[PDB]
Amino acid sequence: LLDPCGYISPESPVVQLHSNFTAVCLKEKCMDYFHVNANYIVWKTNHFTIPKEQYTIINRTASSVTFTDIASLNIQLTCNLTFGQLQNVYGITIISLPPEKPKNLSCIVNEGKKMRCEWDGGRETHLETNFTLKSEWATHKFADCKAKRDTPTSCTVDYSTVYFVNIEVWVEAENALGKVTSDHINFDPVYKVKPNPPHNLSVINSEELSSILKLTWTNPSIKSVIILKYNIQYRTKDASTWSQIPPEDTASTRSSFTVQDLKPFTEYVFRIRCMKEDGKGYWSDWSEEASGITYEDRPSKAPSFWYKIDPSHTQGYRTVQLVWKTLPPFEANGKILDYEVTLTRWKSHLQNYTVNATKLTVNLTNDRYLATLTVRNLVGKSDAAVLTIPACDFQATHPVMDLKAFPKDNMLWVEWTTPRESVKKYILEWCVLSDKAPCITDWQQEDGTVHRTYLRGNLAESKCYLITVTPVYADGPGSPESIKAYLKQAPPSKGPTVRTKKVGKNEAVLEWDQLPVDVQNGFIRNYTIFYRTIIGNETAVNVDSSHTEYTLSSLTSDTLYMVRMAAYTDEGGKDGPEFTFTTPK
Ligand SMILES: *[C@@H]1O[C@H](CO)[C@@H](O[C@@H]2O[C@H](CO)[C@@H](O[C@@H]3O[C@H](CO)[C@@H](O[C@@H]4O[C@H](CO)[C@@H](O)[C@H](O)[C@@H]4O)[C@H](O)[C@@H]3O)[C@H](O)[C@H]2NC(C)=O)[C@H](O)[C@H]1NC(C)=O
Ligand SMILES: *[C@H]1O[C@H](CO)[C@@H](O[C@@H]2O[C@H](CO)[C@@H](O[C@@H]3O[C@H](CO)[C@@H](O[C@@H]4O[C@H](CO)[C@@H](O)[C@H](O)[C@@H]4O)[C@H](O)[C@@H]3O)[C@H](O)[C@H]2NC(C)=O)[C@H](O)[C@H]1NC(C)=O
Ligand SMILES: *[C@@H]1O[C@H](CO)[C@@H](O[C@@H]2O[C@H](CO)[C@@H](O[C@@H]3O[C@H](CO)[C@@H](O)[C@H](O)[C@@H]3O)[C@H](O)[C@H]2NC(C)=O)[C@H](O)[C@H]1NC(C)=O
Ligand SMILES: *[C@@H]1O[C@H](CO)[C@@H](O[C@@H]2O[C@H](CO)[C@@H](O)[C@H](O)[C@H]2NC(C)=O)[C@H](O)[C@H]1NC(C)=O
Ligand SMILES: *[C@H]1O[C@H](CO)[C@@H](O[C@@H]2O[C@H](CO)[C@@H](O)[C@H](O)[C@H]2NC(C)=O)[C@H](O)[C@H]1NC(C)=O
Ligand SMILES: *[C@H]1O[C@H](CO)[C@@H](O[C@@H]2O[C@H](CO)[C@@H](O)[C@H](O)[C@H]2NC(C)=O)[C@H](O)[C@H]1NC(C)=O
Ligand SMILES: *[C@@H]1O[C@H](CO[C@@H]2O[C@@H](C)[C@@H](O)[C@@H](O)[C@@H]2O)[C@@H](O)[C@H](O)[C@H]1NC(C)=O
């Protein structure tokens, strides 16, 4: 390496994005064998140039160029023509948003690690910059955190912290154009603890009381410097929704705690996070989660019971079909072990049974009877079911009454009036009308009381249900009542086939018959029968449904007449197959 003809000042600068650069520039002899002076030289720059009238030749050797103010990202001026013409002398590289009181600033003493402090830089400055974390005990005073380039805001001190002992922090921020500090803060670290989270967690419940399980576990290493205050969240294996638990109900350090009033025999799954008693300091992460079932606990309420009664078999004995429904794994309170019906008759004598299915189908006589189904499990023992299956002649008597049946909202409903004195359960069966589908039925039982219910199978529309409502009083079932109702209608599918009867010299009578159940897809309100001629204006009448004929009236003598008549279900109509008659002369 040798020499560089001429220098500026210096090789590098520093752009304080609003001020003036004092540049000055060709040594004593490089100016000799090239033959110029301060003159010959320009302050060029890869477009136009530091105008002539702009420079100020310092001495028989210089060329000061000052500056506007300043205006973009980099910036590279030139003290780069050899009098005769044709200087690449030296040039530089200035730079282009100073300091910035660091903002925000918090610290956390994350249990386990050392104190840790965050903040916020501000706005993209653009002159690399150095954050430093401070501190002092006024007893003494501490080393300095100095951010990591690859995370220029975080920071961890590097002394173990010392709860109870106000402490002193503030971020000192630096870059090229003037250093500053932040806004001081003063704490007692024991207020920025974030505890590990509780752990080694367990659920139990084999105390054998079916409303509760009870969790328990392990407080965090910090148990012993601060006073824990928790939140046991917990939910049902397969909810999406975490229930919490009253936080005055979990207030200070502890290692156990029983939650209660849970569904019996279910799966539950709990989890907790705790932090320092009052609330002054970050809470911690949730401990793994833990499971647990609940007691079992007797089956709570009746199974559903009824019998059906085939037209006796071997003249005397009368077979009798008992059948009952299954408790929803929730009236069950645990696996169903096996049903049990006992049977009692004529003053004094009776055998029981233990069916493990649901149709007990027994033998039986012509006395009055009375049956009793219960349902047992790994604990009990199931509240009594109860029928009266009678002496062979017990008739009707008292039926329900004022019974409607209808739909909405996409749910079929039957409601009637609460009969006479006091029925001890209704038990309404029902099924679907259609030629080409015997009658298969459904049934539900219904607590005595009630008088409106939404039947519950899987039924269909355009399809038409028959619904019977039998009430059960003391000593048997009552004269039952029955009603039809589709659940949602379509407009018939087919449509009536017309046809005349007779025909005057103007005015003839007409004839149909019924859109047959399975094609109606609904309660046929009414018939519109409309008719035109060849010149074919048309017109029409509508007809009060019940009607099967008519009497198209004042027509022409010697006319071509064409018809076609639609039938309509609330839902709407569908005209039949046009048919064409014609008066005499
Ligand atoms: C011959 O029979 C057919 C069979 O329906 C009649 O045509 C249908 O008639 C119903 C009612 O007459 C009607 O559709 C109604 O829509 C209403 C609402 O948009 C429903 O009203 C609701 O419930 C109450 C019933 O009025 C009402 O008070 C309440 O405010 C609410 O609006 C109403 O129940 C029906 O759903 C149409 O006019 C027609 N429906 C269809 C699908 O065609 C026809 O009216 C009969 N013709 C004669 C001349 O009697
Ligand atoms: C924070 O950030 C600023 C801005 O980037 C940093 O400025 C740096 O200052 C540090 C020391 O505070 C410095 O470490 C130097 O490395 C030099 C380059 O190699 C060293 O040179 C060494 O001795 C001679 C001097 O350059 C040289 O002959 C030899 O080659 C040898 O390497 C220098 O002496 C320091 O040891 C950085 O270089 C400098 N730049 C960078 C990118 O870090 C600084 O790190 C921080 N300053 C403060 C006040 O917090
Ligand atoms: C008649 O009564 C029995 C027992 O007295 C009842 O059996 C119960 O229902 C079935 C029996 O096979 C079981 O369902 C479950 O199957 C799954 C899947 O394989 C299995 O993982 C479950 O643990 C259980 O086996 C149920 O647990 C079973 N046992 C009992 C005590 O109820 C049922 O009402 C009738 N029996 C049968 C064989 O269906
Ligand atoms: C409490 O449980 C933690 C996590 O639930 C356990 O972590 C174990 O590390 C220990 C030593 O502490 C080993 O004996 C085990 O192999 C680890 N896991 C398990 C599931 O046993 C540990 O059992 C407990 N930790 C403390 C600090 O008491
Ligand atoms: C550059 O900036 C200051 C700011 O844009 C300007 O104000 C004065 O300018 C004249 C020469 O142009 C000088 O008399 C002064 O030196 C300037 N400041 C003062 C206090 O007089 C000026 O153009 C340049 N700057 C400075 C302060 O020297
Ligand atoms: C004449 O003027 C300039 C601007 O006053 C002088 O600036 C100096 O930079 C020089 C190198 O040229 C240093 O030796 C000095 O310390 C600065 N000031 C002075 C008074 O010397 C420079 O000396 C002169 N330039 C030339 C080419 O002779
Ligand atoms: C079925 O029938 C039993 C009647 O036989 C016996 O009755 C008395 C004397 C007790 O010894 C009884 O335990 C015997 O079984 C009922 O007692 C028995 O509990 C019945 N099963 C059920 C579920 O009731």
Swiss-Prot record:
<dbReference type="GO" id="GO:0019955">
    <property type="term" value="F:cytokine binding"/>
</dbReference>
<dbReference type="GO" id="GO:0043235">
    <property type="term" value="C:receptor complex"/>
</dbReference>
<dbReference type="GO" id="GO:0038165">
    <property type="term" value="P:oncostatin-M-mediated signaling pathway"/>
</dbReference>
<dbReference type="GO" id="GO:0045747">
    <property type="term" value="P:positive regulation of Notch signaling pathway"/>
</dbReference>
<keyword id="KW-0597">Phosphoprotein</keyword>
<dbReference type="GO" id="GO:0070062">
    <property type="term" value="C:extracellular exosome"/>
</dbReference>
<dbReference type="GO" id="GO:0042802">
    <property type="term" value="F:identical protein binding"/>
</dbReference>
<dbReference type="GO" id="GO:0045669">
    <property type="term" value="P:positive regulation of osteoblast differentiation"/>
</dbReference>
<protein>
    <recommendedName>
        <fullName>Interleukin-6 receptor subunit beta</fullName>
    </recommendedName>
</protein>
<dbReference type="GO" id="GO:0038154">
    <property type="term" value="P:interleukin-11-mediated signaling pathway"/>
</dbReference>
<feature type="glycosylation site" description="N-linked (GlcNAc...) (complex) asparagine">
    <location>
        <position position="363"/>
    </location>
</feature>
<dbReference type="GO" id="GO:0043025">
    <property type="term" value="C:neuronal cell body"/>
</dbReference>
<dbReference type="GO" id="GO:0043524">
    <property type="term" value="P:negative regulation of neuron apoptotic process"/>
</dbReference>
<feature type="glycosylation site" description="N-linked (GlcNAc...) asparagine">
    <location>
        <position position="200"/>
    </location>
</feature>
<dbReference type="GO" id="GO:0019970">
    <property type="term" value="F:interleukin-11 binding"/>
</dbReference>
<dbReference type="GO" id="GO:0097110">
    <property type="term" value="F:scaffold protein binding"/>
</dbReference>
<feature type="domain" description="Fibronectin type-III 5">
    <location>
        <begin position="491"/>
        <end position="585"/>
    </location>
</feature>
<feature type="short sequence motif" description="WSXWS motif">
    <location>
        <begin position="283"/>
        <end position="287"/>
    </location>
</feature>
<keyword id="KW-0675">Receptor</keyword>
<dbReference type="GO" id="GO:0004897">
    <property type="term" value="F:ciliary neurotrophic factor receptor activity"/>
</dbReference>
<feature type="glycosylation site" description="N-linked (GlcNAc...) asparagine">
    <location>
        <position position="537"/>
    </location>
</feature>
<keyword id="KW-0325">Glycoprotein</keyword>
<feature type="domain" description="Fibronectin type-III 3">
    <location>
        <begin position="302"/>
        <end position="397"/>
    </location>
</feature>
<feature type="glycosylation site" description="N-linked (GlcNAc...) asparagine">
    <location>
        <position position="59"/>
    </location>
</feature>
<dbReference type="GO" id="GO:0070110">
    <property type="term" value="C:ciliary neurotrophic factor receptor complex"/>
</dbReference>
<feature type="disulfide bond">
    <location>
        <begin position="25"/>
        <end position="79"/>
    </location>
</feature>
<dbReference type="GO" id="GO:0030296">
    <property type="term" value="F:protein tyrosine kinase activator activity"/>
</dbReference>
<feature type="domain" description="Fibronectin type-III 4">
    <location>
        <begin position="399"/>
        <end position="490"/>
    </location>
</feature>
<dbReference type="GO" id="GO:0070106">
    <property type="term" value="P:interleukin-27-mediated signaling pathway"/>
</dbReference>
<dbReference type="GO" id="GO:0034097">
    <property type="term" value="P:response to cytokine"/>
</dbReference>
<dbReference type="GO" id="GO:0048861">
    <property type="term" value="P:leukemia inhibitory factor signaling pathway"/>
</dbReference>
<keyword id="KW-1003">Cell membrane</keyword>
<dbReference type="GO" id="GO:0030425">
    <property type="term" value="C:dendrite"/>
</dbReference>
<dbReference type="GO" id="GO:0004896">
    <property type="term" value="F:cytokine receptor activity"/>
</dbReference>
<keyword id="KW-0472">Membrane</keyword>
<dbReference type="GO" id="GO:0043066">
    <property type="term" value="P:negative regulation of apoptotic process"/>
</dbReference>
<dbReference type="GO" id="GO:0045509">
    <property type="term" value="F:interleukin-27 receptor activity"/>
</dbReference>
<feature type="disulfide bond">
    <location>
        <begin position="5"/>
        <end position="30"/>
    </location>
</feature>
<keyword id="KW-1015">Disulfide bond</keyword>
<comment type="similarity">
    <text>Belongs to the type I cytokine receptor family. Type 2 subfamily.</text>
</comment>
<dbReference type="GO" id="GO:0005886">
    <property type="term" value="C:plasma membrane"/>
</dbReference>
<feature type="glycosylation site" description="N-linked (GlcNAc...) asparagine">
    <location>
        <position position="526"/>
    </location>
</feature>
